[PDB]
Amino acid sequence: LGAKPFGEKKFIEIKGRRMAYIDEGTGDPILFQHGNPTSSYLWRNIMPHCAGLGRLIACDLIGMGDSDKLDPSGPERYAYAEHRDYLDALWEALDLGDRVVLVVHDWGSALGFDWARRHRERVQGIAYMEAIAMPIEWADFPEQDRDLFQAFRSQAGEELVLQDNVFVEQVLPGLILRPLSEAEMAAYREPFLAAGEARRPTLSWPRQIPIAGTPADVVAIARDYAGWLSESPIPKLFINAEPGALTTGRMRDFCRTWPNQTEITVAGAHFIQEDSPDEIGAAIAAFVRRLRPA
């Protein structure tokens, strides 16, 4: 494993804000996108496996990692649409070209899948894991975390997350099978050390998950890329997890119907990158080598 980050953080001004990201190497991009409540740090032990296979990029979503917070922050800030506007602009500013390989997880997959559907001609391949592949129902949500997420999506959410930082301190470790080190948790809580709005992104995200028809805008967006992905011939790599968490049951059955897809199973719950980074990195690298033959 390892607690040291991959490359050095770079910064760029987007919509009057400063966003952080990792950009190492040359060639066609291999774009890694994290979800909630992580950052580019999530891919630190996976990105190395793709050394020399392309331009390795990992962006910190707005309000997360080393990216700027959006003040004034509040209940209406950090919704999917806002995150998309900033990520779209960052990805445009990075001059990615037209043969991009996406590696997505959690909210990074919702964002990545949507971007791919909108820029399909520029997508060479899609590797995904523990993703939001379609709108779901409460019965599809992981049983052990179901009540907690229903609470996030209620008035109790502010105290749980903004005051007590539950997504970072409880959910994150709770969905990783192996024990995290002091430095690893320090890296994960760093962007959220301050109580209050600094932690808003970690609360707004669960309130955006397309569950039982709400929120309607994200449900529609997910229904859109779900339908598209089920018909798209773009090569895909589905990294299934055991026991897994989000991508299980019906969603997993759905993902398994997607065309031109390779699948492997690795040990892990939700944040599988912390449990099987070498298996994941090796799979992604092989995927890319097949997509980019010499």
Ligand SMILES: [Ca+2]
């Ligand atoms: Ca080219």
Ligand SMILES: [Ca+2]
């Ligand atoms: Ca309940």
Ligand SMILES: [Ca+2]
């Ligand atoms: Ca654990």
Ligand SMILES: [Cl-]
């Ligand atoms: Cl979430």
